[PDB]
Structure 1
Amino acid sequence: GKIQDSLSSALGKLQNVVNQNAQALNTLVKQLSSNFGAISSVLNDI
């Protein structure tokens, strides 16, 4: 009966693997808007 209270009121190891994957997938998309030393980030502009 106390497990149920302590949880109903701790899953950080499961939350961290979700967070890490999302933080990496966002960094991947946010790189589609860097120049890396070009005139723009859009191929329809070059």
Structure 2
Amino acid sequence: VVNQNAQALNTLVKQLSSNFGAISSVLNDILSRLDPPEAEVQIDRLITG
């Protein structure tokens, strides 16, 4: 019963490095390189995932 919680927590951890058909996994890297109107298509695609 501890194994299931610790496994599921590592499962949510690994999802932070998935794209969902995006170009990067760190929101500040998208904000540092492209104005917000030219970044909403990546941000909504990270948000839904």
TM-score by length of 1: 0.60
**Aligned residues: percent identity?**
100
Of structures 1 and 2, the one scoring higher in RCO (CA 8 A, sep 6+) is 2
- Superposed, 1:1-46 pairs within 5 Å as 17-46=1-30
Displacement over 3 Å in runs of 4+: none
Alignment length (residue pairs) = 30
Task: Note the aligned Cα RMSD (angstroms).
Answer: 0.6
* TM-score, normalised with respect to structure 2: 0.57
List alignment gaps of at least 5 residues for structure 2: 31-49
Long gaps (5+) in structure 1: 1-16
